[PDB]
Amino acid sequence: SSPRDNFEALWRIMDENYCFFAFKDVDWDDVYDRYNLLVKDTMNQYELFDILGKMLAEVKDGHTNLISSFDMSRYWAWYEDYPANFYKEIQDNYLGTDYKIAGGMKYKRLADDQIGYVYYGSFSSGVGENNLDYMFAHFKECKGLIFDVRDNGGGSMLYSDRIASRFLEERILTGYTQYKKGNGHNDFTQPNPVYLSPSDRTRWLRPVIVLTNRHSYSATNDFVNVMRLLPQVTVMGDRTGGGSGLPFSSELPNGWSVRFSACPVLDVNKQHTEFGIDPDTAVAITGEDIMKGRDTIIEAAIGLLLAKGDSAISY
Ligand SMILES: [Cl-]
Numbered sequence: 001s002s003p004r005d006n007f008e009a010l011w012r013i014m015d016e017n018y019c020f021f022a023f024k025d026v027d028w029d030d031v032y033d034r035y036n037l038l039v040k041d042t043m044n045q046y047e048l049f050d051i052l053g054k055m056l057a058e059v060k061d062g063h064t065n066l067i068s069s070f071d072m073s074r075y076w077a078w079y080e081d082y083p084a085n086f087y088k089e090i091q092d093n094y095l096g097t098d099y100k101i102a103g104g105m106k107y108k109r110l111a112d113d114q115i116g117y118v119y120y121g122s123f124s125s126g127v128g129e130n131n132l133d134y135m136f137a138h139f140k141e142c143k144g145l146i147f148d149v150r151d152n153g154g155g156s157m158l159y160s161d162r163i164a165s166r167f168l169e170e171r172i173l174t175g176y177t178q179y180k181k182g183n184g185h186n187d188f189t190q191p192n193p194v195y196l197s198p199s200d201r202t203r204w205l206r207p208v209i210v211l212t213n214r215h216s217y218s219a220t221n222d223f224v225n226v227m228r229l230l231p232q233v234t235v236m237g238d239r240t241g242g243g244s245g246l247p248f249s250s251e252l253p254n255g256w257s258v259r260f261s262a263c264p265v266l267d268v269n270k271q272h273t274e275f276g277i278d279p280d281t282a283v284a285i286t287g288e289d290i291m292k293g294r295d296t297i298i299e300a301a302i303g304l305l306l307a308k309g310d311s312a313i314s315y
Pocket of ligand 1: 128129130131
């Protein structure tokens with residue numbers, strides 16, 4: 001397995017399957033011409049790995065990686081160029097030690113029991129129908145809900161759909177999917193509509209604040225995409241980390257593998273969500289709030305939900 005064969009195979013895999021060339025400042029043909037002069041069959045496996053990793057970093061994509069048995073290439077400036085906007089130690093001041101555990105959820109009432117707070121760290125940690133019903137019943141008397149998915153790198157779409165379906169009033173269009181039809185960079189199938197139906201179990205139609213950060217991505221990005229379509233939902237924090245939760249993976253002749261997003265996911269306006277979704281209200285954790293043991297994002301969400309409107313029960 002020669003370096004030039006692995007260079008050729010990797011360039012071709014990207015050329016024919018990478019979905020987002022239209023949104024990148026580089027031309028993949030000029031990337032071929034440049035790296036063609038750099039890859040030599042005298043290179044050892046480490047030199048080849050560094051150069052091919054740099055080649056993938058040309059598309060500046062946090063979702064693209066080259067994986068060998070010794071390293072994984074990454075463009076993590078995609079995540080690291082944004083503030084953390086989440087600290088477990090500051091979150092401990094809100095959850096304490098007496099928070100409740102229902103599957104993959106941590107939950108507790110805040111602000112004199114007026115606000116329900118949920119932290120859902122991973123879509124890989126399952127949530128059952130009873131877990132959700134019990135969490136909602138604990139928050140029966142609450143004015144609103146905080147659903148915090150900051151630092152949630154995704155996981156299973158089964159839990160994504162199961163949680164999101166609890167906030168629906170009726171069946172809705174959630175967005176669209178496209179898939180690579182051919183080798184051409186823009187050779188996609190027509191946008192396919194994806195729908196979600198409301199749950200038959202306990203639903204939450206009261207105000208909701210969804211908390212996001214750059215470390216909210218993949219299945220979490222798709223979850224956020226559905227939640228921001230709902231009238232009772234406000235998304236707060238920072239731009240999500242994007243991605244789709246639907247990866248492409250292929251092996252190289254040398255056994256290394258390349259991965260990236262397999263399909264473009266579009267919102268209801270047929271706009272790409274791959275590069276992340278902006279919150280409704282941008283809020284960043286401040287240096288002085290950390291010093292006070294406060295989470296600026298949780299506090300802004302509490303403030304917004306407590307902001308009193310009319311004293312009327314209506315529709
Ligand atoms: Cl269940």
